[model samples]
Structure formats: structure tokens, C-alpha cells
Target: NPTYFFTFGDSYSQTGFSASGTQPSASNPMGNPDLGIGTTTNGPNWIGYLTTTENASLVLSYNLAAGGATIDNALVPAYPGDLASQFRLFEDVYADKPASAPWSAEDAVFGVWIGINDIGNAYYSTDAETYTPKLISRLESLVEEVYKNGGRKFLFLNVPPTSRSPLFLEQGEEVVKQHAEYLSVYNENLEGMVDDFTKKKGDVTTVLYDSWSFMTKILDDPTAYGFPDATCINDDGTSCIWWDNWHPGMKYHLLQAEDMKPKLRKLGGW
Candidate 1:
């Protein structure tokens, strides 16, 4: 059985966006060799590695993530094509050429890692509070859309702690503290949303990958985790948890994969 893996999110889920060859360097700080070379430092991606190790049973993954996609892109007027759009694209792909000669719902898994770019953009745009409820609503709609698409299993990777990024760290401790506080509120709301969705829709399988907890655990004890000081560096030489302000280093990605593998295998039955 060939399992199709569909990924939808922001740069975190994007493999080709930051690829060294042929990929543009305008918006990708990680693509610049001067920075850290990001996931390319390893090869392919953590997901790519996982799929490869599936022993030819899984089809190569499709990375439909854009650089700065957000939940609002699906809702707001100016920005179009958000998480819902990605799901629809997957449907189109399957419709055009079924995963196999005959497609089965059990032959696919959907991995969604959105919402962080939503909060990140909201904070950067100074609309954090106003977007919280809207973000939650959009998330619910996204989950519903996936269920309607015959998605039996979903990996809902949550937003990491926004305050711990290199960008926030540069803003000073007070700013980092404030951002962390806001991120906590956001994660709490996300937890509530996940619980509600599971309770209401019994067959819609889902798992909340607590990226917030995973990233924060390492950030709180960077030395214990062996995160390089180079892992988080700003243009001005400030240190934080990401190589750039947004993307994690290959080390962080490896750690995250370690955290995610058991959960994914259990949820996906792989």
C-alpha cells in the first residue's frame, strides 16, 4: 500500500522554498550560506527522511506549503489560498490521478502545521489580540474541511512559542516575556479547539503536536539539548532559538522529528 503524505503550512513545512539550488534567496534568510543553510544542512527534510525509511511503501511527499502562509489567507480578502486551499489542492491531485489505480481513504495522511505564521504575522502587524478569536475560528473550519475530504488521520502540529524566536529575543527580555505570555493564551485556545473538534467529530482522527512545548523545553535548557549558539543568530549577532528569526536549524528539526516520530507512527499506524 502506498501512503500519500500531504503537507500544508508555512516555511516550516516547505522543502523547496529554501533549497540552495534554483530557489530564490529574496525572502529566505536560511537559504543564504552566510546564515545557517537550514534543513538543507541535513538532506531533503525530516519528513522526507521519514518517508524514505518507510521502505518504499510510502509515496514521496508533496510539500504544498508557501513561505508566509497563514490561516487568514483562507478567510481574508486580499490574501487567498490558505490551509483550506491546500486541502482542496490535494483533492484535485487525487481526483486527477488517484493515489493508486483505486484510491482508498486509508492510503493517505494529512500533516498540517499552520497557525504559527498567523500569530507571527499578527504580532508583527500589531493585531495580535484582534486575530486570536478569528484564528481559532479559522482553525475549526480547516479541521472540518479536512474531515469532509475523507481524511481519517491528521497531524495538527501547533504553533511554537513565538516569544522564544530570535526576533523576540532581540527585542529584549521584557518583550520576550510578553510574547511568551500571549503565546500561552494562544496555545490554551488551541487546546480547547482541538478538544472540541475531537468531541464533536468522532471519526476525524487528530493529534496535536505540541510544538510550543517541544521548542520551549529546548529553549529553556539550550545547553542540555546541545543547540548551537549559531542555531539562533540575528543580523546584528544576537542569539536565539532559530538560525534565522523564523526557521529552526537542522539540529532543531532533528529534535522535533524525534519528538514527533513516535506520535506520528502511533497516530498514522505506520
Candidate 2:
């Protein structure tokens, strides 16, 4: 049978999907705004690759990610929408399993990849240490919300190595080192949260994608990954790993989806 993928994330994962916009169908699995439009990577994002090129089966992707999003606006002052709003969007539109996309708990997967903006917006603050636990706490509650709404399969992606990003690299070694420290704290806490959430929720299957390691691997060997360099942010997406100082090119997202194919299938997301 076909599967449904509901995604919630930030610019790194956003494909500009709308609940009221064109809905996914076999003919157009990614739905409206077209495939490459409104993406931060200057091409199809991870959700795009997962729903189309890397999917194990026919998957209807309903993406609720937004550009510059955090877990919650109150905690991190995100752009416009947050996890709460994304869930509300899901509740308002797709929760009913409408005929357009009749998804059920067993055949559907929920993917959440937040924290880029959360950590980005707060990592430099003196109170940065205090925010991660709060973010994880709220994340636990949000997972519960999805569980109550018939989502049993969950995919959680941790923060990437923003310390190596051109935005931070320009800030010099001390700043980069500090940002790396913050990222370590966040990813560590996130793993613990995932483990605890799984232990607490008996029937749920949670898959935590260690995006930090994957990104670092590529950045560590950019030439091996078909990039001339890791540190260059080029207007031409193919020239470098990053499309801009902060966002990665389509290669990163596409490679991530490809690498994650087996894991997603392991959770029966296919």
C-alpha cells in the first residue's frame, strides 16, 4: 500500500508546502508551488528527494516546514510559523484522513527536523545553556500531540554543523568553537530525549537521524562528495556545498535522503 509522510522543519527542510495548497497525488507527489520553487537550497530539499527520488514506495508527502522556523516562537523568536502552528496545520487539514490523502497510523510517518533556527537564534546568548532543555521539553510534548493524533512512526533529525558554516566561519575560530560546543550540547540532549520518548511511548517507533555527523562527514571531505570546497558559498549551487552562507546546496539534502532511505524503510515508512 502507499504511505504518507508528514514533515515539520525549518528552511533546511522546507519546500514551501501549504495545507490549503495543491495536495500530493501519485502524479504529483510533492504537490503545488512546483518541485524546486520556494526552496532555500536553490533546488529540491530533503523532503523533495525523500518523497520522490529516494522513496521506497509510493509516498504522499505533506510538508509543513517553513523558512526560519524554530521549535516554538515563544522560546526562540522564529520567523513566522513554528512546530505548534505546523501541528495545527496538520490537525486542521490532514488529521481527518481526507479522501485526497487517506493516511493511517500504520502507514504514515512523521518527520521533524527543527533546531537550526532555535540554536542559531540563541547559541550566542549568555542564557544559551538554559534553552536546549526547554526546547527538548516542548519537543516531548509535541511528540505526544502527534501520538494522540495517530502518528506512531517518527523521524527526528538533529542539528547540523552550523559551526562550520560560512556564517560562523567568518566569525573566526573562537566563535566557531563556541558554536560547536553549543551544537554538541543540543545533539546530546536530543539523543537522550529520543531514547526517553521511545521508552515512554510503548508502541512508537522513533528514528533519530544524526545529521550532524553526516554533514560533518561531507564537510570533512568535500572533494569526495563532488564539491570543490566546503567553505565556499556560491550563487551557483553546484560549485560549493553551500548555496549561501547558512543553507546547504541541493546536494546535501539529496544525499541525506539517499543515505536515510534504509532507515526510513526500517521503520516501515515505506
Candidate 3:
């Protein structure tokens, strides 16, 4: 009775997928989302929380997102298990999917919550005019490859307002300004790109979750999401909004699932 879900992404999607032993839990004394294994949160990221706590179905995860992974290997030096590598891993499983397996394309969910490292590293052209077209091309190919391999449901999570991240806040408004602008461009292109993918596939469902919109709304009124503000990093990341300078705390991570799960159910028909 093995359940299944597939994710191709960067740090935001990793969940010790490569390890074949007892996986640590947020329930444990040690709280580690270190190496961007899940969320920036001290506890479970949205994906884990969503599947286990809010899922309309039973589906486990096969997360192959490596920290510092870029869209293309050339984008970042020595990026382990980039999209291509992750897909190769998936393809291997697809090539030998046991007939007894209960799940198929319809039962499994595929998440593409990437682009942080790409934008963060400023991979390729930083200017939208120059970079966007290239990114669209890359994304289109990614979706098509997955579709060909029987992946039909696509949930694309856009990059949030990294400008508001604790890291950028410390870098001054100038750095924040650059990241903000980059986020807008990438996100804007993201919706259109995903739409085009859906239009082409006709059978696939592609929805770009505005990762920044809800977060921004929450920041404007954090009480709704169990916080006073989006920032405010502290040692007790379970209660804070930010775990470190870059990612979410446990509470914020759970907040995302609370906001995102129903929407996913609507789109995915579960």
C-alpha cells in the first residue's frame, strides 16, 4: 500500500529523499531544515504538512530537490541533481514502475516550486527582457518532458517576496529592491508560461500559486496567519515567521499549507 507523489525542485522541495534510513521528524528534539531540506522553517515544510495533515488523499513524497540546484547545470557551477538529473531519477522509476503499483499519473501530484536558486544566484541574464524568454523555454520543456512521462497535474509555486526576507532586509533596501524586481519579473512570466503549458497539453492542470500574494497579504495582517509580522527571526523558529535569513519558520510553513491546501484540492479535483 505504497502511496506516491513527485516533486522536482530545489531546496524548498527536498526532504531527505536520498537517505534510506529513519528520517528525523519535527517532533524530535532536533529541529533541522538545514541544507534547505524542506522549508526554512524549524518544523515541516508546507508539502509534508499538506500531505499528512490536509490531504484529501493518501500520497507520500519523492522529493529530489537538491540545495543550490539551478534550472540548468550551466546556470550554477556544479549544481547537484538539477532539473535534468531529478527528471532522470524519475524516469528511472517510470521505466520500471511495478504493475502492482496502485498509483498512476492521476493519483500522484507533481510540484514545481523552484526558481529561488535561479533568481537568488542570478543565473543567466538578470534582466527580465533577456532572461524571461530563456526561462520560459526551459520551463516549457520541463513540463513537456514530465507530461510525456505521464505527469498531468502541475502545481507551480512562484517565488515569494524575497526582498522582505531577513537576509535581504539586512542587505539594505538596495539589495531588497533588486530581488523584489527580479521576483516580480520571474513570477509574472511564470503564470503566462504555465498557462501556455496547460493550453498545449489540454489534459494537464497547471496552476501557478502566487506564493508572494498570500504572503504579502499575511504580512499586511499577520494575525490571520498566526504571526505579528513576516520577519522577526528568533531561536524558537516554531513560533517565529522566519527561521533564518532565507526561509520560513514552522508556523509560517504550516500557514502556507493552510492557505494553499484547499486551493490545490479545487484544482486537482480531490
Give the Å error, residue 52, model 1: 2.7
Arrange candidates by lDDT, highest first: which order?
2, 3, 1
For model 3, residues 84-192, the per-residue Cα lDDT tens digits are 7777776765424544223467665677877787787772346766786676578678767767767677788888776788887888888888777877888888888
Residue 208 displacement in candidate 3 (angstroms): 1.7
lDDT of each: 0.60, 0.85, 0.67
TM-score of 3: 0.85
Which residue pairs collide, candidate 2?
Answer: none
Which residue ranges in model 1 land beyond 4 Å of their true spot? 17-42, 53-59, 74-81, 95-103, 124-130, 228-231, 234-241
> What's model 1's lDDT at 224?
75
lDDT of 2 at 168: 86
Top TM-score hit: 2
TM-score of every prediction relative to native: 0.76, 0.96, 0.85
TM-score, ranked from best to worst: 2, 3, 1
Displacement of residue 241 (Cα, Å) in model 1 is 5.4
Encode model 1's per-residue lDDT on 59-169: one tens digit a residue.
435556665677756443223557666656656654344423233467556777877666655554444455576788887776676577676667777788766666667
User: Best by lDDT, which number?
Assistant: 2
Model 1 lowest lDDT segment of ten: 23-32
Q: Flag the better candidate by lDDT, 1 or 3.
A: 3
